[PDB]
Amino acid sequence: IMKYEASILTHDSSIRYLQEIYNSNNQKIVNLKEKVAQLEAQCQEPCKD
Amino acid sequence: RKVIEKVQHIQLLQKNVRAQLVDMKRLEVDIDIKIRSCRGSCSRALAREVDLKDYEDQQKQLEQVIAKDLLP
Amino acid sequence: KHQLYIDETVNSNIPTNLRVLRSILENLRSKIQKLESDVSAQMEYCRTPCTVSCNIPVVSGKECEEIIRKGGETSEMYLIQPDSSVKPYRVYCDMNTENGGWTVIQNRQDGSVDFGRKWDPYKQGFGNVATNTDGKNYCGLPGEYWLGNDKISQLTRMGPTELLIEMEDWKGDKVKAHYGGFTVQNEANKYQISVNKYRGTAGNALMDGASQLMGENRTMTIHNGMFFSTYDRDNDGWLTSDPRKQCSKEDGGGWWYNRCHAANPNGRYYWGGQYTWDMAKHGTDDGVVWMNWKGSWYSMRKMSMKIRPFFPQ
Amino acid sequence: QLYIDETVNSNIPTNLRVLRSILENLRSKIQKLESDVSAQMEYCRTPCTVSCNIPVVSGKECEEIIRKGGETSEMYLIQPDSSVKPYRVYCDMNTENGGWTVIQNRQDGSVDFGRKWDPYKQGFGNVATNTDGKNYCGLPGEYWLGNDKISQLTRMGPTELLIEMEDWKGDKVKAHYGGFTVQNEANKYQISVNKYRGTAGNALMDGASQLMGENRTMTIHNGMFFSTYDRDNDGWLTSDPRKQCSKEDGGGWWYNRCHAANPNGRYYWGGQYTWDMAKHGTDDGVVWMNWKGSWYSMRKMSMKIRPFF
Amino acid sequence: AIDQASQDYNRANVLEKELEAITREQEINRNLLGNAKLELDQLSSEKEQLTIEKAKLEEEKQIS
């Protein structure tokens, strides 16, 4: 016991960073959800006769 | 004391990751459909595939990994 | 020894918990990459619409029936006019199928059209009626559409009209389902459906209900005598007052909904057929579904709705 | 239009490869330095100690002491004036004729010499340290005696001076000064050596030997005032935060404009040190120009006195 | 930055080129033992067939 109080940090960065990716993706997703709603309105028109 | 407080985070995390891994499936589909739904509106249509075998290969994991915790 | 116990191994089972948790979160990044890229390429394609040259053929009529009698005898798009106080409109008549005179009022075959529409687009109709067959001047092939409500209502409201429904699984077997009686009502009667005189290889999902659900649980998958509802207009058989008991939710098709369905041809076109609970937007069964022949998690490859007036006896 | 420079886009690769393998070399450098300055700060929880057994033979200075039978090099205690509290001091009783009273020493950079005005007046550093297993401190420490203290030692009469120094190759050379005087504080410890002789070049009266004309005359220490990083008395009467000889973390000295020598300079290891190593891009190290150069700091460096016969 | 991190992982790209080359060197590491045993196995019995000949050829002297 010495680094059994040091590895909790080597494995605490790897929590706050994992949560960081996640939180970005949950934002990046709620962003691509707007950009789909903008492809819906664009695909309602029947082929031009 | 500390190593116990970690799991509380490392599980609220992993339960959130499966919740996101869900929507990345629901979306990838909702997308493959809404693009197909353009074939008859727009001059060109995007020629694509959907690899689901991947999603259920890393849904195979995560769960196969969700072991016990710290109770006994 | 009950004190030489400490879990030092929570240092070999945590590496193998981020060795995965990152191999997953970063593999979802490179996915949001690819989806962002595609919704962009198509968004650029959708600057310039597709084109059709639909040369309305000579012979008209009231309905696709008249048109076959009136010497029109191949399957393509025609214009028709029921009553005189109605502006004419186009339609694809099936002439080859059985004895012709078939007024196609719904079609699916490649998902090419969105069906997750509000009340109004369903009231007016929507989608492609037909498409320029290869290198010809007449639109010979049909396109996915829904001929619209007001139009489909009156078109039966006239005299005895018989309904027909074909469909296909992704292996290429088909079935049908005739209904020697058919009625859709006006608007203030919430476009109330009503059928009878069933026969055919697909199972009377519209009057009897689902083949698998029984008792009270089947009496709720009955489409007969049902009002019409869309994701913005709630007119389903539910009377539990909550925005979580609507049969039609966002991005779901409009149909005659009870509690809820034995069949939905206005579903969402899931490719490959097989579609699980965690693919659906709401987790529900919202696809091109005819329960009585394929279950609850199967979206039909093809599905059409053709009608004709009542004569054969 | 054969002028397409998609070539300017296949050396940005080779470029960014470098500029990352540089910026992320320097990052893991600040790693080791964050780490080490942390470790030293822990060793510096508890001071180093010495047990210094004051010899019996006293006096006014280290000549008296060698005449009074005290015949080995170690710390002694001395009292030059009656009304001036006695103080410890190292004496060299072995060089030429003994009787030397060391007032400045350098040999391992074990002392921070870049100190303010006040800490230059009193003095600072280790006067000597316990040797081997012996009970007397028979080895010298790095120190500056003290201005006040050096002022009066010389102002007592004809005091000579010896200056020793070693390079890192193993060579030594001396620099005598038959005369030597340092005034008090209201006279800004004004030096003034003379009667020079030796093998290390009169850096103090002549200026730097590789200089010329006026630009050499302005590197003469002789007759100079004394200045330290917080108190300025160099040649530059031009007041500006840019024209000081003694800048932050640089030894106080008899600075002109600026120096032919600074033994109160900083202890660069190895010897050779260049402009990018210096905090201020100056020649702030342990330098005696007239022998080694302008970018070379000395291995050893010692300043001893002993009244003149 | 995240895009950079993720870009530099990667990582596994290089790691699993060893998880697929180390074991390749390990399968043949038991082919050091499982062969340097059978190689020196062949030796002792080979040496003992030499001894059976000598403690036999001497009996041909007793013939005549």
Next chain:
Amino acid sequence: AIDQASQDYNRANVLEKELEAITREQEINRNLLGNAKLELDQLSSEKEQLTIEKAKLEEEKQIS
């Protein structure tokens, strides 16, 4: 984030230098395959010694 980028960068660059280190032991792979020919070196000298023994046996049984 950056801490991570760097951590990954370096571990990658460390791995670069380890993949080149194992591929000098792949040199000594063609040395083990060079011992199946040194097995047959003694396997054939056994078949060669064996047939020498029972050629001597045929002779002692005919002097009795």
